[PDB]
Structure formats: C-alpha cells, structure tokens
Structure 1
C-alpha cells in the first residue's frame, strides 16, 4: 500500500508540475452529485493556494455536445482543463480536440495509460489495479493530487465523497488510507454511533425523515414522537445517549429487525458542518436542486451557503418521505415493483429494498425504463440483477448492470410480461 502510493506518486508529481507551470486560464469541469461537488471543493482550495484563478463548471454528463462546446473556448487562449469524476470514458473525444487536460476519474478507463500524449495526464485508479467502484472515489483521486502540495486538511472533503458515493461500508484500499491519514493529522475523529445522531435536530424529526434506513411505521413526526415518548426518551433532545440508544434499539427491532443498519462509524471532520454524513446529505440535496455554486460555497465553509444548504436539505428530506409514502408497491413472487417518476425511481427503489429486490419503472414515450435494486445480503444469497435485467433482450429491449443495481428498457406494452420473466429468474437465483 505504501508501495502502490509510490507508483501513483509518479503521476501525481507530474500533475503537480503541470499545474504549477501553467499561467493561463484554468477550466474545472465536475459532476453534480456529492462526490463531484466535493471534488470541485478540493480542486478549488488547492488551486487558490497555488495562486491559480479558475473557472468552474458543473455538468450532469460529458456528452459529445458539451465536449464540442468548451472546445470552442480552446481556439484562442488554450486553457488547462481539469476533469473530475469524468473524462476517462470520453478520452477519445478529448484527444480528438487536442485539449490541454488533466483527467481525475475513477470510472473504468477506455485507454489504460496515465500519460496519453504530450498534453494529457490521466489519473485513474484502475490503471494501478484499484477498483474505482469500491476502493476510491473521485474526491479521493483529487485528494491524492492535493496531498502532493501537503494540503492534508482537504482530506475531510474526500471523506465526504467517500460517503456520498457509498464506499464507506466496508472501507477499503485507498479510501481506508485516506481516512487513516485524516485521523493521523487530526482532521477527523471516528465514533461508532446511531444514525439518528448525525442530524443535530430533535430526534423525533431525525427518525421521522430518515431514509437510511427508511422505517415506514415511524416516518412521520407524530408516530416518531409517540414511539419515543412510549419508551421513555425525550423526543426533543438532539442527541441520544447510550441509555437512550439501548432502549431505542431494543424497541425498534420489532418494527425494523435489521438493526445493524442503524449503527454507523460517524466521521467528525474539521469543517463548519462537523458531521461528514450530514455534509454529504446536504451536498446531495443541494446538487439535486441545481444549487451547484451554493454547494461549492458549502465546501468552502461560507456561512450563508451552509444556511441555504440546511434549509434545502430538510425540504428535500420532507419531500422524499412524501414521495415514498405515495409509492404503490406491488408484489410478485420474488420481487416488488412500482411505477414512479423519471428522476427518482432509482433512489426510491434503493430506499425501499428490504427482503426482496425492488424495481421501479417510468413510462416516457412507448419505452418504459426500469431501475432495479437489491442489497448485499441479497447478493450473498445469489442475486445478480445484471443477468436478470439482461432478459430485456427477449422482449425487444436492453438491460444489465451490477449484481446489486441494474437498469433496463422494454417496450411499454411488455411491462407485465417482462416483470414476470424477471421475477422467475430471480426466484431461481435465490434457491
């Protein structure tokens, strides 16, 4: 691990030299999710500290269109482009326009070389044998650059990215090295705790609007207040102590039996939003509302951006619970399914997973698009969603993905027939 860093150092030292020696305009292009907003915050602090002004842009996807734009900016003043959380999959188009570019990306690469030509450096963990889907995130890749300047304090934003991208449990590889470095330098403290204590609000509100895990019987202030009053916990206190937690967990197992999902390692970071899980949820809510520049401001610790962020988070959590209560969950033999809204079927499906996989779909044209979700105990019993969604190619469509998360497309009139098929495949996977 000490040795794997030494091979990565070769690429990060060249990235550092390329940034220091460049005196023109600098363009940063990042994603809108939590990992991309954290990456943008890391790059922003790092560039400022090395005396670089820059122009930051947030894109949902790096399409052929957007790369062709931006290439128009290249014609006079060829700026240095830093791509975060993107770029590796689009590298052919980036070479094609001869960008001066640094690509900081954890997605599977098309070209497995760190040094592409004279003008392009690619920092991608897959080139070093590190799985970008479980051992490092985009904000961790940026952090690896940042630490060549000795900016260890930016490790707190990598931890946020680690949470936002769902790589915190288990904590593997480079992610584990980053957290341990942050703890060594005292930028983070680690504390096993109950998930409700990350919000610093009245516990009955934390319970009421929690979606990790979602507990339907408690998903309202009234029901949460009453449940707490019953077991002798003051519903208005903002932190459960050890006696409260024992009493809560003892009672709650009857409503939600997988109570291990309520216990987490909390990360207390050196940041105005001291809970990394809360900062992660805040960045997520802000990015889903299009408040990109506010999200950078939150990473940069601006008080007014943090105030906006807190207001937008609790609005986003209230609306999510409401959407969750409006889902009409239908049950086949081995799965659940539901029709929902185009932007949220995947989020809703992952939230609803309990004992069986959950598939949401939305009907747009005559197309019908599906998002399937399971969990790790389902995978350990033999679930693989990619092959179950592949069956879409029998109903004139396309489907695949990962064992725990997949999608598919199938003509609008074959919906019932496709779900029956998927239901049977899955039932045989789990015997």
Structure 2
C-alpha cells in the first residue's frame, strides 16, 4: 500500500526540510529542461522563496561528468547547498567524490539504494521504497512531497503538470494518485472527461491539424482537418466542441481510423493562469526544447509575459513538429526502429512513433551523437529495459541510461551504426 511507503518517505522529506531550513549560505537548484524538470524548478523556486531562501537555479540538458566538474568549482569559494531535481541518483558517485553538500530528488533508477548517503548528502528516490519512477511518481512529485512538509498544497498543480509531461497520467497510480487526490481535496484541481482537442482553446481545425496525441497523419494539416469537420457538419472555426459536435467527431474518426485511441482524456483544470494542465505541459515542453529555460520557470511562477512567449513558442513548436513528423525517415533493424532528427524533436517523435517496437531517434551536435530511446508499458512488461540497453554506450566510449521505458545516450558521432546494432542486439535478448 502506498500510504505505508509514504510514511517511510516522510522520514526523508522531514530531514530534507530541516537541512534546507538550517542552511544559510548559497542554494543552487539544478533541474532538467523537460516538462517535469521545469515543473520541479517551479515547485522548488516557490518553496524556497516561501522559506526565505535566496537561490540560483541552473537548468541543464544533462548532468554530465563535465557539468558536475564545473559545478564542483563553486565549492572552493563558498560551498552551496545543491538541490538536484530529476537527476543525481545515476551520477551519485561523482557527487560523493566531489563532496557536495547535496539533496537529490530523482525518480530515475538509483545506483546507491541509501537515503542518507553520508553526512553531506540526502537522496530521496522513490525506487528505494519500491515506488516505480516510471509509473507511480515523477521528479515534480518528489519535489512536491518535500514542499508539502511546509503545507504548500497549492504547488500540487505543478506536480500534476509533471505527471502529464512524464506520461504517467493513464493509468494514474501510486503517489501520483495520492497527489492528484490531495489537489482535488484542497480544490487546486477539477477533473473533467473531455475530448483532447478542447484543451487548446483554438479553432478546432488547428487543434486537430497539430495534435500529436493522437497523431493522425491524414488530418495533420489545416486544410485536411477543416474539410473533415465541414463534411460532418461541425463549424471548424469554433474553439470548443459541445456534446453533439463531440459525438459526431468521435464517431467519424473512429470509423475511418478504428485503431485510434485516447480521444477522450481526463482533463485537469488547475489553479494556474494556464488553467489546462495538459496545455501547460505542452507549453513547458516547447519552451524547454527552445532553450527558453528561464521563461519556462517564469511560466511556472505565473508571469504574464513569460506565458505570452510560451503560447507563441508552443504553436511554432507544434507546427514544426508536424513538419518534422512528415519528413522523418524511419529505418528498421531487427528489434528497433531509429531515425535522425532535429535537436528538440528526437524524444517527442520517438514517443509519437512507438507502436510494436522501441524507437530510437538521434541528432548530431558536433562530434557526438545524442540518442533518445522510447518504448511503451507493453514493451516493458515483456522485459524491455532501455536503461540497461542504452548503458552499452560505454563500450563505444560514451554513456547512456534513464528509465526502462525512456533512456538516452551519447556516443562518438562516427559510431552511430555500431551502437544502434549493439542496442538492437541487447533489446532482442531482453524481449
């Protein structure tokens, strides 16, 4: 039962609370640029301000050796307390080595399965308590568990954004279910079953044209969606589908595309200026993929100009993604598919294209190839573990890891094919 696990986690969250309250030097917050990472940053920014802590937040694309070494040089002068969100558990040995005063809030599989690592380091990792970081909690939800020690229940809305951004909303399980229920109880969220296209608050033909959940290639243009809606007697220019319009749209799509799934979703209407948590999730993703880290934090903190930028960037991103999806050249090996793509689109396209087999996208940035591998729950249940599969990057001079269902890696740009074959081989066995 999760309530028992939560009593055990509360021992770590109470200790983190005290470590934060009793620290009076610099505080450094390190997060990732994904929806969940940016949401974590927002939760922590609010929590720290409310507890009278000034802080310096840095967003990194990946917690590499090199980044850890650069951060470590800040320990010489005046040693900050470091708070790592969505990272640090895999890199724990480098963090012990540099002797950071650190709090690690991470849902990726842990290397050292201890909560209290030395005198200097606390690790809150749900896997340590048998909670699945791929299905039952996100980094934002770990951050929220700390925040709720101060009674900051309002920050639950950012955890919900993280649950959505990390694809842990269907089914809603574990601590994620607890968080949502706590938000509902404190009236920070209302839940409402609805069609996906209603979240966008734009003309429906555009909602349809640019939707990637589900992605319907035949309808993935303004002209084709407009015509589609015209043909079944929906006004394509309206911004919300009513009961009747929904009935007609669902029956028409399911007829023509009987495999399609998830047209109806449980919308989360949150206490935030961006009221639809699904839209906020997409917004944060888009800004994060555009390198607009501080804007993403501003959106979490409900700044009007940051939200205006977020809307603008969101729609540019979604249009660019449809274009990318149309031109991507998917290649088959034995157990996987892969593709070269643009930085910022690799992971999302891989998630969109997964059907029967893992998909791995990559992009070249200098002399190195960066990979995003995606599976699904079905594949993991049959034994997929991309964390282990992508780890084989070490044999080719690089490194990789992440979750069973989603992992990354880097290798030398000229070892692409070698790596992918070695991963293809590993994944074959796993399954």
The TM-score, its normalising length taken from structure 1, stands at 0.87
Q: Displacement of 1:70 after TM fit?
A: 2.1
Any stretches of 5+ residues in structure 2 without a counterpart?
none
Number of residue-to-residue matches in the alignment: 430
Distance 2:70 2:401 in 1: 31
In structure 1, the residue corresponding to 2:172 is in which secondary structure? coil
1:396 deviates by 13
Distance 1:211 1:20, change over 3 A: same
**2 CA distance for matches of 1:16 and 1:265?**
33
Aligned to 1:314: 315
Q: Secondary structure at the match of 2:360?
A: strand
Query: Residue 362 of structure 1: SS of its match in structure 2?
Result: strand
Structure 2 vs 1, CA of residues 389 and 257 (structure 1 numbering), >3 Å: closer, same or farther? farther
For residues 401 and 245 of structure 1, do their structure 2 counterparts lie closer, same or farther at Cα, with a shift above 3 Å needed? Answer: same
The more displaced of 271-280 and 70-79 is 70-79
Once the two structures are superposed, residues 259-301 of structure 1 have per-residue CA deviations (whole angstroms, 9 ceiling, x without a partner) of 4321211100000000001000000000001101100100000
Contact between 2:134 and 2:405, CA under 8 Å: does it hold in 1?
no
Deviations along 1:174-229, one digit per CA (max 9) or x if unpaired, are 11100010001110111111111111111110000011111111001000011001
Deviations 1:294-345 (A, max 9, x none): 0010000000000000000000001111111112456789976544446534
Q: Secondary structure of the equivalent of 1:254? A: helix
Q: Specify the SS of the correspondent of 1:368.
A: strand
Q: CA deviation at 1:61?
A: 1.4
1:359-380 residue CA offsets vs partner (Å, 9 max, x unmatched): 5566789998876545445667
Which deviations, in whole Å up to 9, do the C-alpha atoms of 1:141-195 show, x marking residues without a partner? 1100000000000000000111111111111111110001000111011111111
**Quick one: distance in 1 between partners of 2:267 and 2:336?**
33
Structure 2 CA distance for partners of 1:255 and 1:85, relative to 1, 3 Å: same
Structure 1 pair 321–74 and aligned structure 2 pair: CA distance change class (3 A)? same
Q: Which moved more, 1:352-361 or 1:366-375?
A: 366-375
- Alpha-carbon distance in structure 1 between the residues aligned to 2:396 and 2:120: 46
CA contact (8 A) 1:203 1:235 kept: yes
Instruction: Report the Cα offset of residue 258 of structure 1.
Output: 2.9
Native 8 Å contact 1:104 1:141 kept in 2: yes
Highest Rg: 1 or 2?
Answer: 1
Change (3 A) 1:356 1:95: closer
Residue 346 of structure 1: how far off its partner (Å) = 3.9
Structure 1's 196 and 384: CA in aligned 2 closer, same or farther, altered over 3 A?
same
Deviations 1:41-88 (A, max 9, x none): 001101111111111111111222222222221123222111111111
How much does 1:423 deviate? 9.2
Stretch moving more, 354-363 or 294-303? 354-363
Deviation larger for 382-391 or 51-60? 382-391
Query: Separation in 1 of the partners of 2:312 and 2:129?
Result: 41
Q: 1:26 and 1:394 mapped to 2: Cα distance?
A: 37
2:352 corresponds to which residue? 351
> What TM-score, normalized by structure 2, do the two folds share?
0.87
SS in 1 for 2:58: strand
Query: Would the aligned equivalents of 2:321 and 2:345 in 1 still touch at CA under 8 Å?
Result: no
What is the SS of the residue equivalent to 2:256?
coil
Q: Which stretch shifts more, 271-280 or 15-24?
A: 15-24
Answer whether contact 2:26 2:54 (CA < 8 A) is retained. Answer: yes
How far does the alpha carbon of each residue in 1:203-256 deviate from its partner, in whole angstroms, 9 at most, with x for none? 110000011111111001000011001101111111111111110011112343
- CA deviation string 1:110-139 (max 9, x = no partner): 221111222221111111111111111111
- Greater shift in the superposed pair: 255-264 or 334-343: 334-343
Q: Quick check: 2:268–2:278 contact (8 Å CA) kept in 1? A: yes
In the TM superposition, what is the alpha-carbon distance from 1:2 to its structure 2 partner? Answer: 2.6
State the secondary structure of the residue aligned to 1:122. strand
Contact 1:391–1:421 (CA under 8 A) maintained in structure 2: yes
CA shift in 2, pair 1:161/1:99, >3 Å: same
Structure 1 residues 111 and 158, CA, compared in 2 at 3 Å: closer, same or farther? same
Kindly report structure 1 stretches of 4+ aligned residues shifted beyond 3 Å: 328-346, 353-430
Shifted more, 409-418 versus 203-212: the winner is 409-418
Q: In structure 2, do the counterparts of structure 1 residues 338 and 79 end up closer, same or farther at CA, with 3 Å as the change threshold? A: closer
How far apart, CA to CA, are the structure 2 residues paired with 1:66 and 1:386? 21
Q: Secondary structure of 2:177's partner? A: helix
3-state SS, counterpart of residue 419 of structure 1: helix
Which residue is equivalent to 2:188?
A: 187
